[PDB]
Symmetry: C2
Subunit: 417 residues, 2 copies
Amino acid sequence: MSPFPLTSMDKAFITVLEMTPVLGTEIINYRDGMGRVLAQDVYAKDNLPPFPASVKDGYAVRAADGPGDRFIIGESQAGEQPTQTVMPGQVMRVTTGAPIPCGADAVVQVEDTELIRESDDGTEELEVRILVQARPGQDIRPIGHDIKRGECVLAKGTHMGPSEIGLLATVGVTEVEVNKFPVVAVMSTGNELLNPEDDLLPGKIRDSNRSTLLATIQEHGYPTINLGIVGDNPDDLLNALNEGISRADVIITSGGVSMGEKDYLKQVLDIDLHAQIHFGRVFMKPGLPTTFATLDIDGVRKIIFALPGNPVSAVVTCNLFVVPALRKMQGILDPRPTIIKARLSCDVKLDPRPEYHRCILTWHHQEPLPWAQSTGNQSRLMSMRSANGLLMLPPKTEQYVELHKGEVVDVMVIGRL
Amino acid sequence: MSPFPLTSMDKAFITVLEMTPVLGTEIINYRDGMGRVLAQDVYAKDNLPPFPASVKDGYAVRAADGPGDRFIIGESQAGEQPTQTVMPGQVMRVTTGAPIPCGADAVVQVEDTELIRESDDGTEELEVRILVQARPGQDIRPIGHDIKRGECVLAKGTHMGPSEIGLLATVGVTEVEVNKFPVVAVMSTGNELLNPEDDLLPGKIRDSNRSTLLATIQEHGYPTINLGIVGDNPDDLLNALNEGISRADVIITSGGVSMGEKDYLKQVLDIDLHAQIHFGRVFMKPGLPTTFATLDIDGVRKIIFALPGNPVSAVVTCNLFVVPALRKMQGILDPRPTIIKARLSCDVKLDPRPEYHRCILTWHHQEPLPWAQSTGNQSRLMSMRSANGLLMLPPKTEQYVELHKGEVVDVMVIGRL
């Protein structure tokens, strides 16, 4: 209760995912579907193609006519239903995607033909030599070849990207049920903090955590609310938390959670807000004082992350705990982060705690594993790259105390790549 | 000119990057910086910390006093400049981040002390035993330890993520010069096309390419304009292109670029728009009829991608050619896509052309390389995942005609992971 027990990193992570709710559903326009999870199955109400369609530029023929010289009776062009029937000894010009006319049963691509006659002005083809024996149905997509009416084309639980949006467009299902996205409120606490826009005053520094955290959350596509800087005292913290609860599904605070003139926050969460603190310390480096609470009001579960004030600790813990919770809330069935294998670019000393650090992942020519280079430790160009990984290093053992350059380690992906 | 020469995939890609311009600059608020590239160096105008700051909860001491019993004359708390001077035999309580008072030269963490006396109500500490010999300056961050006034903290060319936004906040540089993002207009052409919202009519299908392409571009954070469906005829195409040129930096069309009742588009680009077509066919699968043009109007270079109408071809070529061009336009110095190594989940037949296909990348327990599974080829859960990779398979040779399950191949990353 104070000091809260040290919670293992594995227990803390499982606890967050177990206790975090899945948000309810809403209907959206399909164009707004990026990153959403479907909460319904989606069915085709038409065939694709809905008419027999040519695969090629060429001619719709009767296969039974075989090769030979044919009169061209017209053309079938994309977008128009032909009105003519192809009779023996005749063909119709077709383009890719055009409907196959009545009377024809195959398409012969233009490369397997030679033109015999055209109009005097050259605009219309009149007679063509078909050089091959068409196979029945060749170069035609029959009705429903790609999608059948009544086919389920997307399952509930699908996490949508551009191709899924395109598939919704294809089948004309322009309104879909999806899980809501979490609204995430972020505040900072500490009497030393000024806004980024402020000149410094004695004893003060600028608040960076709000900005870093909001940007991290925005990067993942979730709506955010900036609740500003809150004074480190019980009344102001309670008011800010109540605003967060009212306005958002998730409240993130940073600061006020180490031991000292600080645990107003853990105290306010418990005694004033009546929230359930599930852990208040985690055996990790950085991130020791990380706190996770839930609050149930009238059948709704709010989640509260009280992150360390240290700016590095705040951003590491946001990636380890907050992002997976948000993924679960927005309906992603397996909300775990992507963890990949990479080679260390430098030796690193291990701690009794599992340790985490921002890094850059780079592939080197034809080498199969990427290299991971911890940020902050210098070339010019590499010192400029934005972090796309979080090194996840194991606790030291009486055996292994140090990992060396080249050795394969776990890296959580936190940026593109 | 028609048929345009087959351009190699390598030549086509280099051509796009060589001919694509870098957009000009603008000043933005730092909160809007995600994914932007800085067009200025950024300097600190203050020190961090700007005062000597305690690293620990404990006491500010005189090291020369050594261990022993000390009167506590007050407390230094985060955010307030202390007014008292610590004299021999005295200490001041400090919290993490608090300023070190005059007269003290070290901090002793609370764990290396024992309290002797406190006020009758327990609220104020009065006397403490210092159990250790402090080293001079111990557990103090001196002025400028982390950032010095006048230090360049971010270089021009930096592609910003959340930590860079936080660093801007730290140093109070809330307005920054960055490259503009490209505005990308997308249209579809073809007489067979209906809008997603439409019921089918004879001879028609719904347009999916606009949706897929717009979503792909939006995923990368660039503003878009939907120019709708354009009839496959010279006048309407010219008008739509002119609108695109007026409204956007990049125009993407799909359809009207194969050979037949189609190359109104390549013809309109050349004769009516007076654009320079750099290639009109690419030796690739899919994507043969992919066309890239530039148009210089009054010192401004517009870029035009005329992508194939086939919906699969359109999305593959968007990822190979369009996204890297957009990355260059928004100022990214090395706009190449991230290509990783992965193991094939299935045998695949090679083509005389290099071939590309959407896939899913998955890591398997402790195996170092991810597995790549081509989409569309079926488990239930895997058939549901959204594509995060594009398989990049080599042309066949008289030697190698087939690649087998397990073999290591190139995959372009196109989704998170």
